[PDB]
């Protein structure tokens, strides 16, 4: 509970201007119900001179004084109220913007610079807790969003609920009467909210269940593509996709008439409780006296005040995300662990080097598999010898060197360095002492000489020149531009790994060091950098006692003592050739050495035309926006009608007038509302019941006839196809109605606000023609401010930021301390970048703020100016000034909208043109019908020449290379190779998604090039590479009518025998009806390829492929693949482009394709005597 007090900590003043803050927003927040308290009570004022002055029937000759002396007094004292409170919230709202961007932001600057020098201040209190890369993700952004847990939505939130409370107090000082109705029906708001986010999930959770079936047959049909285009289940799959896209909109049409139903019982409630506080006003007049229309007025303004409560609910929604991201993570900022390894402080030891012994040590942090990092050590070596340490199996070697210097304390045991025991030393000058090496190519955004300083920052130039000679990386430094102060890219931008690792060795050696710690970074280095790497790591070396750990066994032949640390425990320990003996590790080595989804390119024009082949209907949504529109000005509109005839109407029969107000008030907006919202909620549902369904037929229906490349070399993984099949798809959906919601608020303001303007006494139309555009104006450039600082914020934090993502990953920041200080130190100017960009935009927001608020009183004092004064001395009027009031609302309400169209208009008109491009296509894999039942292809005698091939990405090497073959039925060629040879590059061709790059190909008789698809997979079936077996039952699994074979008993029967699936036809449950439910919910792969062998037979055909994915799936199924496959090829034109090495010696004609060449080629039958070459040339396969 309660910790959202520590985010505004470090002292007492902290808190202080917060609440300065939060009080400046509350009386902010109450001068706007009081501005319409103000405006209420003088139009009972203005409606009492209204009553003398049409009843005085033989007297408006002595108002026309009398009567205009009162009016030029009240024109007069209206102007002092409307000034004064005018005034004052120029200042108050500008105080609530230096609260929420400056005393929240100076508490921001100084909880990150508490986090980043408390994270390198508690070294074990933050390693065993999250992942790398993701961790420190979230730190960069929940640090931010801990600005919303200090946000302006707190002092939203007070000043509403202030002006609500207050606004209760004043009501029941005017009466009890409507203090309890606005309390009463508040909680029916709140509840009838409560009830939408029911009639959301309870439906919407059905609906992605219902597609998410077709989200498994789009991915399996993309993903296993060549199974499900060769088998031409493409045929079964143009529906059994399409029902779930029917399904899915049976749920989603019932949903969207039920939510649109849901709001309009909100509007229906909110203009019902406008009726209901009309009559219980009535009746203050209509039971007991206690009314003269000035006892309702102030309930006007507590309504304003539950309403701003109404708009602090979304601001305290945001809140509650922050709040969440807040306190979940400051576990990690104030009250945080804090140092193990004394990593400030401790007794500086003149001890200058010490005996190197591990005792009793472990390391209890679980590895994501492993118990423990560090199992259990124990380990002696003496000043004056070296040690290897060496490994391979999992964790805990590089735990050992963090122990070795107390980078971290170990949880059991301790480690001897120095004299002075390692609990008791000073963090500083043991990291003197020792100098320490690490795997990462870092150099730093900063020159080579300040790269060193990052070594020990206490240095010379002859310190730096010294340790260049020293790491012999001196030479490359000197043919550099500015010598050792080279201007640096992040990482080291123009700069080689090896070349930053140089750099690293001399780092190191400007501690002039007397004991040397080593970390990998030498191993799989740049190799011209590897071996002067090696030369210089081995000029570090042996001027002290010195580990070493690297792959290369040239710097483990210098050691007189060698351990095996594997796993994080010590094993095997003896001197260095002794283990060459033993076998060890060391011997172990020598034998191992010797997504953009809505993407920017928009197409106009091309996206409105589609319009016309998705819309012979529905377009009547545009009449249900148009009237929608319409309601939004008219409950203004009625309501400043229905008070202004009562308050000029009076006493006399002020039943038969109040009771024909209420009854107009309620009918014309609640009934219409509620009618209205169902039009619009059936029209943009019945248009969302065809476009779901048919958009996504288009597109998907359009990648499955996609030719060349996109099934080849995409580089795309499936589900970034279904990515856009929700984002760019939503996205369009969006302005499906954000389009509509244009249309609406041009009706609710320009159409409407021009009719209302003929019904004034139309000075007051160019009053209105005045503010409106001034106000639109204004948001509609206070909107680029607020957007155009966010922005800049980014690049303003981000160039400030570089020097924190370079640092965030790299840990070792503690292994020089001082470093950690010069970052903070850097830090304090650059996270100063964006606090003064938190004071610019504090200046220009406080600025627009209080113009924005200052618009609002000057449309309200120049309204009531110019509709009493020099219109009231030609004639007395009394009311209207209200619907002059709505029209300014008018505009209000189109600022409030116009804004949030915006960003879907922005990502919807590019992702539209994403679906153009994958509807247009390319033209080469559809269907056709050139050249079906040809009898001279009952054969497959199929003829290669000239045949030059390679996959879209070329420097994969051509993987045919000129080739002519003659093959015939009753043979089996058979593809040779190892490591991704031959298999892709094959059956792009068979499906034909593109064609040879030289050379053709015939079936018999024509080019493949010429056939039509469907009739090609006449002939053509294959062992799928994936063990798929997609919906339903095994039934509708095993034949489909694509092109000209049956779907009956007797060729399910045929093919279930000839697969010899018929062991679970004959024997065992669930048979050709086989609930495999998606994909196969109690079957093996063994069992689905069986199903692919039936899918096989089903063409009878006269050729076959042998395919992978056949000796790794249950046995039983993989020997009855064998027993069936080398009993069904002999009288066929067969291919095998399996790897499976039975195949390869049960063949008849073989190529062996070494890298795309020919090396060997033959007869099975001429090679099968041969052994060594035609042994290897298998045996090497897979």
């Known amino acids: 509970v309660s910790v959202l007090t520590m985010f505004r900590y470090a002292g007492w003043l902290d808190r202080l201007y917060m609440l300065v803050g939060t009080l400046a927003a509350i009386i902010h927040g109450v001068a706007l119900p009081l501005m319409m308290l103000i405006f209420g009570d003088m139009t009972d004022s203005f409606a009492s001179v209204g009553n003398v002055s049409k009843n005085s029937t033989n007297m408006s000759e002595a108002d026309k004084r009398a009567m205009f002396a009162k009016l030029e007094e009240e024109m007069t004292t209206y102007a002092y109220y409307y000034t004064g409170i005018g005034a004052g ?5 500008y105080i609530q913007v230096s609260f929420w961007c400056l005393a929240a932001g100076r508490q921001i600057h100084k909880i990150r610079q508490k986090f980043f020098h408390a994270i390198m201040n508690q070294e074990i209190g933050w390693f065993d807790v999250h992942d790398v890369g993701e961790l420190n993700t979230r730190l960069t952004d929940d640090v931010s969003k801990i600005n919303e847990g200090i946000g302006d939505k707190i002092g939203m939130f007070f000043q509403a609920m202030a002006t609500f409370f207050g606004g209760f107090i004043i009501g029941f000082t005017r009466g009890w009467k409507l203090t309890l109705v606005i309390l009463a029906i508040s909680p029916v708001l709140g509840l009838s909210a409560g009830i939408w986010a029911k009639i959301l999930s309870s439906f919407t959770d059905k609906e992605l269940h219902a597609y998410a079936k077709a989200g498994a047959v789009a991915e399996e049909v993309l993903a296993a593509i060549r199974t499900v285009i060769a088998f031409g289940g493409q045929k079964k799959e143009l529906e059994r996709y399409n029902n779930n896209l029917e399904e899915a909109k049976r749920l989603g049409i019932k949903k969207a008439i039920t939510a649109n139903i849901s709001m309009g019982a909100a509007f229906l409630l909110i203009y019902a409780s406008y009726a209901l506080a009309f009559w219980y006003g009535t009746s203050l007049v209509i039971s007991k006296e206690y009314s003269i229309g000035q006892v309702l007025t102030v309930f006007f303004s507590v309504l304003i005040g539950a309403f701003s409560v109404g708009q602090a609910s979304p601001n305290i929604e945001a809140f509650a995300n922050a709040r969440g991201a807040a306190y979940e993570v400051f576990k990690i900022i104030d009250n945080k662990p804090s140092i193990d390894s004394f990593s400030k402080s401790g007794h500086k030891p003149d001890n200058i080097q010490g005996n190197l012994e591990f005792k009793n040590i472990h390391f209890s942090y679980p590895s994501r598999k492993e118990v423990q990092i560090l199992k259990g050590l124990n380990l002696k070596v003496k000043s004056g010898q070296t040690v290897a340490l060496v490994g391979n199996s999992g964790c805990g070697k590089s735990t050992t060197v963090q122990l070795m210097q107390r980078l971290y304390d170990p949880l059991d045991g301790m480690v001897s360095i120095d004299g002075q025991d390692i609990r008791t030393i000073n963090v500083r000058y043991l990291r003197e002492i020792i100098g320490v090496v690490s795997q990462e190519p870092v150099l730093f955004a900063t020159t080579i000489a300040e790269n060193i300083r990052y070594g020990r920052e206490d240095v010379t130039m002859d310190e730096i020149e010294k340790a260049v000679k020293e790491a012999n990386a001196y030479d490359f430094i000197m043919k550099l531009p500015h010598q050792f102060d080279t201007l640096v890219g992040e990482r080291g931008a123009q700069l080689s790994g090896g070349q930053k690792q140089r750099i690293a060795i001399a780092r190191a050696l400007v501690r002039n060091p007397k004991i040397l710690l080593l970390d990998e970074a030498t191993s799989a280095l740049d190799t011209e950098s590897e071996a002067v790497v090696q030369a210089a790591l081995d000029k570090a070396r042996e001027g ?32 260095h050739d002794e283990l060459m003996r033993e076998k060890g590790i060391y011997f172990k080595l020598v034998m191992t050495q010797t997504l953009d989804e809505d993407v920017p390119p928009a197409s106009f024009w091309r996206i409105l035309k589609l319009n016309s082949t998705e819309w012979p209907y529905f377009v009547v949504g545009i009449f249900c926006a148009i009237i929608n529109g319409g309601l939004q000005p008219a409950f203004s509109v009625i309501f400043s009608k229905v008070v202004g005839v009562f308050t000029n109407g009076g006493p006399p029969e002020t039943q038969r007038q109040n009771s024909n107000l209420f009854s107009l008030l309620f009918l014309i907006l609640g009934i219409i509302s509620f009618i209205t919202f169902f039009l619009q909620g059936f029209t943009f549902g019945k248009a969302g019941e065809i476009l779901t369904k048919r958009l996504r037929y288009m597109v998907f229906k359009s990648m499955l006839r996609q030719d060349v490349s996109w099934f080849d070399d995409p580089k795309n993984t499936t589900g970034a196809l279904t990515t856009r099949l929700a984002n760019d798809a939503a996205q369009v959906k969006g302005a499906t109605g954000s389009r509509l919601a244009v249309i609406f608020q041009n009706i609710a303001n320009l159409g409407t606000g021009i009719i209302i303007s003929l019904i004034y006494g139309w000075q007051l139309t160019l009053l209105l023609l005045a503010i409106v555009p001034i106000i639109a104006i204004a948001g509609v450039v206070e909107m680029k401010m607020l957007s155009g600082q966010a922005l800049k914020d980014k690049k303003e934090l981000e160039g400030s930021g570089k020097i924190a993502t370079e640092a965030i990953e790299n840990f070792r920041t503690v292994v020089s301390l001082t470093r950690e200080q010069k970052f903070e130190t850097m830090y304090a100017q650059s996270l100063q970048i964006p606090y003064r960009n938190a004071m610019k935009k504090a200046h220009v927001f406080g600025i627009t703020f209080s113009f924005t608020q200052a618009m609002m009183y000057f449309s309200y004092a120049a309204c009531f100016r110019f509709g009493a004064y020099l219109v009231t001395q030609q004639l007395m009027t009394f009311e209207n000034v209200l619907l002059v009031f709505s029209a300014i609302v008018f505009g209000a309400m189109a600022v409030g909208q116009v804004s949030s169209f915006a960003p879907d208009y922005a990502k919807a008109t590019v992702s539209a043109s994403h679906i153009i491009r994958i509807i247009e296509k390319t033209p080469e894999i559809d269907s056709y019908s050139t050249q079906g039942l040809k009898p001279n292809m009952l054969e497959g005698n199929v003829q290669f020449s000239g045949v030059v091939f390679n996959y879209p990405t070329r420097p994969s090497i051509p993987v045919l290379q000129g080739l002519s073959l003659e093959v015939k039925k009753g043979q089996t060629l058979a593809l040779v190779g190892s490591s991704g040879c031959g298999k892709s590059t094959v059956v792009q061709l068979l499906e034909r998604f593109y064609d040879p790059m030289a050379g053709s190909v015939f079936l018999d008789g024509k080019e493949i090039k010429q056939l039509n698809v469907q009739w090609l997979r006449a002939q053509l079936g294959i062992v799928s590479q994936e063990p798929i077996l997609f919906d339903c039952s095994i039934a509708e699994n095993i034949a489909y009518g694509d092109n000209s074979r049956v779907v009956s008993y007797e060729e399910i029967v045929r093919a279930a025998k000839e697969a010899n699936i018929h062991q679970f036809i004959d024997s065992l449950p669930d048979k050709y ?21 039936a899918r096989a037979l089903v063409r009878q055909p006269h050729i076959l492929l042998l395919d992978e994915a056949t000796s790794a799936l249950d046995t039983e199924s993989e020997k009855v693949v064998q027993e069936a496959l080398d009993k069904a090829r002999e009288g066929r034109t067969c291919i095998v482009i399996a790897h499976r090495l039975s195949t390869i010696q049960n063949a008849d004609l073989i190529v062996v394709i070494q890298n795309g060449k020919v090396k060997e080629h033959g007869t099975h ?9 035609y042994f290897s040339m298998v045996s090497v396969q897979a």
């Open 1073 to 1093: 009806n086989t609930r495999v439910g998606d994909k196969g919910t109690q079957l093996s792969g063994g069992q689905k390829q069986r199903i692919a062998i």
């Open 544 to 575: 002290r006692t010195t580990i070493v750990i690297a792959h290369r066994l040239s710097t483990v032949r210098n050691a007189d003592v060698i351990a095996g640390f594997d796993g994080g425990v010590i094993v095997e320990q003896g001197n």
């Open 1165 to 1173: 039958q001429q090679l099968l005597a041969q052994k060594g070459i």
């Open 89 to 93: 919230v120029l200042i108050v709202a």
